[PDB]
C-alpha cells in the first residue's frame, strides 16, 4: 500500500495468498515486519518500480514472475527504473536475470501451480479441485488420479483450466493452509529472504 515498509510484487491473484502462506511456515511474519503483497494484475511492473523506486518513495519491495521470454524486455523496464542510467540492450536473458536478483527481482522457471503439484502438493491440490467442482466428468477425475499418482505427467492445460474455473484466488487461499517450508519454490524463498533482509537491516 503506502505506509508499508516494504512491498512484495506479484503478477496474481494466486501468488497475493500462497506468497503469505509460505511466509508463515518460513517464519517470516509480513504483517508484523510491515510488509504487504501487491498484485500488478498481469505482467508490466514497470509503475509499481516506478512508484517504490529511487525517483518515488524508495520503499523496499521484491519482485516475483514468471519466464514464460518475454521476462528479458520486463526486466530490463524495471532495470531502466532502478538502475536509471545504464544500458541493459546489449544483454540476453540469463545475463539480465542475473543482474535482477541484485535488486530482488527473481524469476521463476515453471508456472505456480504445476510446481507446487508436481513439487509435493499434488494430493491436497486434487482434495481442493473436488471440493470446489464436486460434478467433475469421470474422464477428469480419473486424469487428475493420473496426475496424482505420477506427478510428471500431468496435462498442464487441463490442470490450469480447473483452477481458473474454480479462480485463481480462491484455489489459492483454499490451498494455503496445505503449504509447508518443504514445498517452497526457491523463487518464493529468495524474495521472502531478500525483503525480510532488506527490512531487518534498517533496524540493525
Ligand atoms: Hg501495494
Ligand atoms: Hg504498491
Ligand atoms: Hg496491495
Not at 500488478?40 to 519491495?61: A, D, M, Q, R, S
Not at 544500458?87 to 540476453?92: G, W
Not at 469421470?138 to 506427478?151: H, I, M
Request: charged share 25%; with cysteine; hydrophobic share 45%.
Amino acid at each position: 500500500i503506502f505506509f508499508s515498509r516494504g512491498v512484495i510484487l506479484v503478477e496474481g491473484d494466486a501468488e497475493r495468498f500462497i506468497v503469505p502462506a509460505f511466509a508463515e511456515v518460513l517464519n517470516i511474519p509480513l504483517d508484523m515486519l510491515g510488509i504487504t503483497v501487491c498484485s500488478v494484475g498481469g505482467t508490466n511492473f514497470t509503475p509499481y518500480v516506478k512508484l517504490l523506486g529511487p525517483e518515488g518513495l524508495n520503499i523496499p519491495h521484491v519482485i516475483l514472475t514468471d519466464r514464460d521470454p518475454l521476462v528479458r524486455r520486463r526486466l530490463i523496464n524495471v532495470l531502466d527504473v532502478i538502475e536509471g542510467g545504464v544500458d541493459h540492450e546489449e544483454l540476453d536473458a540469463d545475463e539480465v536475470i542475473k543482474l535482477a536478483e541484485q535488486y530482488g527481482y527473481f524469476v521463476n522457471e515453471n508456472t505456480l501451480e504445476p510446481e507446487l503439484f508436481a513439487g509435493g502438493l499434488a494430493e491436497d491440490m486434487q482434495e481442493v479441485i473436488r471440493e470446489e467442482l464436486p460434478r467433475l466428468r469421470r474422464e477428469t477425475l480419473n486424469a487428475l488420479q493420473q496426475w496424482v499418482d505420477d506427478p510428471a505427467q500431468i496435462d498442464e492445460d487441463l490442470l490450469l483450466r480447473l483452477i481458473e474455473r474454480i479462480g485463481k484466488g480462491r484455489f489459492a487461499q483454499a490451498l494455503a493452509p496445505s503449504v509447508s517450508e518443504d514445498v517452497c519454490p526457491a523463487y518464493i524463498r529468495s524474495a521472502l529472504e531478500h525483503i525480510r533482509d532488506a527490512i531487518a537491516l534498517e533496524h540493525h
